[PDB]
Design a protein around this ligand. Structure first.
Ligand SMILES: NC(=O)C1=CN([C@@H]2O[C@H](COP(=O)(O)OP(=O)(O)OC[C@H]3O[C@@H](n4cnc5c(N)ncnc54)[C@H](OP(=O)(O)O)[C@@H]3O)[C@@H](O)[C@H]2O)C=CC1
Ligand SMILES: [Zn+2]
Lengths: 95, 86, 208, 340, 126, 114, 134
């Protein structure tokens, strides 16, 4: 989900791009700007929300020791989903 | 041209500022009534020498030593700098 | 305290304390302090005037025979009035032991050279002069040994910055490698890593 | 004004001087010194090069990381120049050649390319444009070099009203072709001259002073629209100048006269080489041309540059031309030249 | 004898090799560092520190890093007492500013004041 | 305040050492410009030697001037043999370094440094 | 427009309401071509041909001591006596008290977050004002 500025230079996920009057664009003349197009926010926004049947849940990122430290998420709010702090997965109580 | 402001620096505990403290506590009120538009800034400090500063026109400044003075010497000095205006 | 605690050698501690008493009572003119650490290491802190007789005694006495000068350093502690501490490490092959001899000097008081006992001390205190500015009197060939040829200052002093005051680059106008005032592209980011909680109560200094 | 063009630092290698300069023909003689002086204050330098990058290797270590940007360009391609100068704020023109080749004549390198560069710098909104002409540029000059330089200077002035034109007299330096030419002529005989070389007056200027004048003209806001004349502090006749050159090199000096028509035929023979010619008729006519005096134009003293005489740098230039016997002779054991 | 009566002021400015612009335009600061208010520990406020004034830091044109031209930017020194820091600063010819150590005054803490009978120091909840 | 000396008891002997060192340096400058093939005149080198000697003219303590005499003799011995290069000899001439601002106005224009 | 510095960008002295002088320290440097304030005034006095007799910060602080000696002794509260003289002088001009009741300019929490130019240009203050107004 990359976005291009009116000058033709792409914008990274951090929002960095060069202005039209910036002299630092000359480093890209005759070469190319290395920008990663797999924006992580869009890919984590497409994960389905996991419906569980407990007040609390545990997340480890999948894979056990190959993931993040095991955190515990509370699901007492019926308005918002409980998002894991590391992997960004969101869980939701079915009641 | 003339005098613009007067600055009197002194101490509260030193005996060298004894005469300046006496001069202030006796005659400062009638001095201020004599010169109502002349800023006479009194500045107390801890370990400074009794000193008299006069500011004249175009930034000329004059200094008068006030160390170990009695009150009468202080007020002749102050009338001298008031009547000089140079 | 069996698997993860280092065992202690009490026999070595007692023997080194006995030899420290022996040395400190043989030479009362120079010896100021004698200390044995918890890992059985002896330190004989003496007066700087008695560098040469203490080392001569340790090299030549039949009950010391510390024939090898293993290593000779200098340590800078700026809070002292004698900011430089000179440390001699001696090894006795006959009795199989190691002893340490510490002395003190500042920037302007010369220290007597110990080349008359050990000949490695020549290069060792030449390096000490290069890195700290400690002048060693009655030295055969005292010059710089590690620093640059045109280098001014002593780098291992604690008031010397990590990056020096100059840097070298090649200039094409004079066709020469010239030295300019330093300008780091990225500054050395200083990290404050001291914890504000006391770790060892045994080393607690008394308050004022 | 942009935030990234504000100067920063102490003017060192890693500092930011706020100068974005496109220097044309930087792989030559003045370009080395100009890029060296620009890179040591921390300036963004753009080098468009026609030759091999291997010839730009020596220019590579002259500045910090990312401060020199190399790219390709052509003299007959305005789009490449538009690519090169679209981000710069100072443009410096040092394009020239001592001879005309099978592809480029004097009109191409002295009239067409400077006019194209100045036009596309004006169209790209570059505030400061600097052109390096010659001091003796005359429309009625004998050689095509000075005629084409005068025509190109007029074209640049008429197409860029705010252009600064710098007119050096003659440059001497380590990699020059003025003192080295005289010190290498000794191979072919006994240094022929025209009328013994005592009818022409030269005032050469040091390369470092020219570079300092160029840098100060970049920095000075009052140099916009001026036409400077960079000349040395002393005037010498040609005969005793060559005599001083050979006395510095400790070489035998046996001058002999040569007629003007005989010298042109000699220059015709040397200039048929497919490589760089050793000499040509244009070099002959410029060597024996008196440097004119223009008191109405500002000089190096108006830019705060103190002129250094030839006596302090001639040994540095010509020490490589001595034999083993005279390699270690000092500064002062050479009688200095006689001025006018 | 072999001892010299020396009465002049002690200086080693000509031996340290630091250039003059970093020896007469600088300003050393001698201070006991303040406690980090995020923590209750006081073990970092025991030793005096000498530091220097902060000069210019600019951004790198290539990578945006913080470049500086100060050699003395990251250099601090630890002293046991104030007098040693003053002597070290005066020895090297640095003009110094000394700020006094601030120690907390002893308070009057009592648990029974939370449940007073006629005072305003009753806690609302415990 | 009685302290150990280095070589000289009083300032007269230290001045004698300074004078002898400066004599030897003044002798050495022609050989220095000859062997290292510098492009400066001998007068320029002798003025550089005089300036480097005048840079330490305000110090009156015998021990520190003895240490500077020791360092100067070390550099003289370093230059007597060819242990320095051409660059080490010409590092006393800061030719590559641009001139710094001196007055208040130029320092105010160039940056925030005092 | 003359770009000056800020209190985190220069070493400078401020006196609180109790008469205690204190000095700031240089945390960062001013951006762009912004300079220190006394440097700007001194450079103006140099250009205008009325040059002031100070060049460094210590000389300006010496002048500050010359005008008032209590402005250079930091972390010190000096005694100010002679209340009686001021009281006797204040009884001369008989100013008449107005009938307007004493209404402070800061009545609620929404009047606290925006006082000066630094706080008015903050987004955290804007968020706080928007949070307390709703
Ligand atoms: N004698 C002197 O030194 C004096 C010179 N000048 C002027 O100063 C300028 C610089 O002279 P100088 O550096 O000594 O000479 P050089 O020949 O050494 O350098 C000229 C530069 O121009 C480039 N160039 C030449 N022809 C072309 C072309 N057709 N297209 C693109 N680039 C080209 C060359 O690059 P490449 O290597 O790729 O060919 C080279 O980098 C010239 O304009 C000259 O007239 C003025 C007064 C005195
Ligand atoms: Zn997770």
């Amino acid at each position: 989900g990359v976005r291009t500025s009116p000058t033709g230079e792409k914008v990274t996920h951090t929002g960095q791009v060069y202005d039209d009057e910036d002299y630092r664009r000359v480093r890209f003349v005759g070469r190319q700007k290395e920008v990663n197009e797999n924006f992580a926010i869009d890919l984590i926004a497409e994960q389905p929300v996991s419906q569980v049947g407990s007040r609390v849940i545990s997340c480890d990122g999948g894979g056990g020791a190959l993931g993040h430290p095991r955190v515990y998420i509370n699901l007492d709010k019926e308005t918002k989903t409980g998002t894991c702090g590391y992997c960004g997965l969101q869980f939701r109580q079915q009641h | 041209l003339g005098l613009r402001e007067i600055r009197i620096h002194l101490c509260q505990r030193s005996p060298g500022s004894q005469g300046v403290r006496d001069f202030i506590e006796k005659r400062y009120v009638e001095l201020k009534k004599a010169n109502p538009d002349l800023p006479i800034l009194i500045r107390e400090c801890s370990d400074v020498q009794p000193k008299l500063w006069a500011r004249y026109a175009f930034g000329q400044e004059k200094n008068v030593s006030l160390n170990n003075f009695s009150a009468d010497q202080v007020t002749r000095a102050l009338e001298n700098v008031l009547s000089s205006k140079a | 305290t069996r698997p993860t605690v280092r065992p202690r050698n009490d026999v070595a501690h007692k023997q080194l304390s006995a030899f420290g008493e022996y040395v400190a009572e043989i030479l009362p003119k120079y010896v100021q302090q004698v200390q044995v650490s918890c890992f059985s290491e002896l330190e004989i802190c003496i007066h700087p005037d008695g560098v040469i007789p203490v080392l001569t005694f340790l090299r030549d006495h039949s009950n010391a025979q510390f024939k090898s000068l293993a290593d000779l350093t200098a340590v800078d502690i700026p809070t002292r009035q004698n900011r430089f501490e000179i440390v001699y490490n001696l090894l006795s092959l006959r009795f199989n032991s190691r002893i340490r001899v510490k002395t003190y000097t500042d920037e302007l008081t010369p220290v007597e050279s110990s080349v008359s006992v050990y000949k490695a001390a020549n290069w060792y205190e030449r390096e000490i002069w290069d890195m700290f500015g400690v002048f060693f009197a009655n030295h055969p060939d005292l010059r710089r040994i590690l620093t640059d040829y045109g280098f001014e200052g002593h780098p291992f002093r604690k008031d010397f910055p990590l990056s020096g005051y100059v840097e070298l680059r090649y200039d094409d106008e004079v066709k020469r490698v010239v030295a300019e005032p330093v300008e780091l592209a990225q500054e050395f980011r200083k990290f404050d890593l001291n914890s504000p909680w006391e770790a060892f109560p045994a080393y607690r200094q008394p308050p004022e | 004004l942009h935030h990234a063009v504000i100067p920063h630092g102490k003017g060192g290698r890693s500092s930011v001087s706020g100068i974005v300069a496109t220097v044309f023909g930087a792989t030559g003689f003045l370009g080395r010194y100009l890029v060296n002086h620009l890179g040591r204050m921390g300036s963004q330098v753009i080098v468009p090069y026609r030759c091999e990058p291997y010839d730009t290797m020596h220019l590579r270590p002259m500045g910090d990381l990312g401060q020199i940007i190399f790219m390709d360009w052509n003299g007959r391609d305005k789009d490449s120049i538009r690519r090169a100068v679209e981000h710069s704020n100072v443009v410096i023109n040092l394009v020239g050649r001592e001879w005309e080749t099978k592809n480029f004549d004097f009109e191409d390198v002295f009239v067409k390319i400077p006019q194209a560069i100045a036009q596309v710098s004006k169209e790209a909104g570059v505030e400061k444009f600097i052109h390096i002409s010659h001091l003796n540029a005359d429309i009625k000059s004998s050689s095509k070099y000075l005629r084409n330089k005068a025509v190109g200077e007029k074209e640049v002035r008429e197409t860029f009203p705010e252009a600064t034109i710098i007119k050096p007299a003659d440059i001497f330096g380590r990699e020059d072709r003025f003192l080295n030419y005289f010190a290498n002529i000794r191979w072919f005989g006994g240094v022929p001259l025209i009328s013994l070389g005592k009818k022409t007056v030269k005032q050469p200027v040091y390369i470092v002073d020219v570079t300092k004048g160029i840098i100060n003209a970049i920095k000075d806001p009052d140099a916009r629209g001026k036409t400077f004349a960079f000349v040395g502090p002393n005037r010498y006749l040609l005969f005793d100048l060559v005599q001083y050159v050979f006395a510095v090199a400790h070489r035998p000096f046996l001058p002999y006269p040569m007629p003007h028509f005989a010298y042109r035929w000699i220059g015709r023979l040397f200039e048929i080489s497919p490589f760089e010619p050793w000499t040509t008729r244009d070099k002959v006519e410029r060597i024996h041309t008196t440097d004119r005096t223009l008191p109405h134009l500002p000089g190096l003293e108006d830019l705060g540059v103190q002129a250094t005489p030839l006596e302090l740098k001639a040994i540095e230039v010509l020490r490589r031309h001595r034999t083993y016997r005279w390699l270690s002779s000092e500064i002062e054991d050479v009688q200095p030249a006689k001025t006018v | 004898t072999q001892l010299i009566t020396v009465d002049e002021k002690l200086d080693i400015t000509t031996l340290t090799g630091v250039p003059e612009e970093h020896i007469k335009t600088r300003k050393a600061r001698i201070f006991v560092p303040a406690r980090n208010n995020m923590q209750s520990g006081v073990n970092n406020t025991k030793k005096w520190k000498m530091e220097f004034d902060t000069r210019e830091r600019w951004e790198n044109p290539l990578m945006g890093w913080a470049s500086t031209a100060d050699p003395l930017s990251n250099l601090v020194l630890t002293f046991s007492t104030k007098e040693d820091a003053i002597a070290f600063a005066e020895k090297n010819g640095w003009s110094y500013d000394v700020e006094e150590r601030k120690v907390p005054k002893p308070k009057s803490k009592s648990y029974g004041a939370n449940f007073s009978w006629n005072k305003r120091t009753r806690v609302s909840t415990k | 305040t009685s302290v150990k000396p280095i070589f000289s008891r009083d300032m007269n002997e230290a001045k004698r050492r300074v004078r002898e060192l400066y004599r030897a340096w003044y002798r050495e400058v022609p050989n220095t410009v000859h062997l290292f093939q510098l492009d400066i005149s001998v007068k320029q080198g002798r003025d550089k030697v005089r300036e480097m000697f005048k840079k330490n003219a305000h110090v009156t303590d015998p021990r520190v001037v003895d240490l500077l005499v020791i360092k100067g003799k070390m550099e003289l011995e370093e230059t007597i043999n060819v242990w320095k290069q051409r660059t080490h000899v010409m590092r006393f001439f800061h030719e590559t370094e641009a001139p710094r601002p001196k007055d208040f106005l130029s320092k105010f224009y160039v940056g925030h440094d005092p | 427009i003359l770009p000056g510095a800020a209190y985190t960008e220069k070493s400078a002295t401020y006196v609180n309401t109790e008469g205690r002088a204190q000095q700031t320290k240089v945390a960062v440097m001013p951006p762009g071509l912004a300079r220190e304030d006394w440097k700007i005034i001194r450079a103006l006095s140099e250009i205008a041909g009325m040059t002031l007799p100070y060049d460094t910060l210590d000389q300006v602080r010496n002048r500050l001591e010359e005008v008032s000696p209590n402005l250079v002794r930091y972390d010190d509260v000096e005694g100010a006596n002679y209340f009686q003289q001021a009281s006797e002088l204040s009884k001369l001009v008989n100013q008449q008290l107005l009938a307007d009741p004493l209404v402070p300019p800061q009545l609620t929490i929404k009047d606290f977050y925006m006082t000066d130019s630094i706080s008015r240009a903050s987004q955290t203050m804007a968020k706080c004002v928007k949070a307390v107004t709703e």
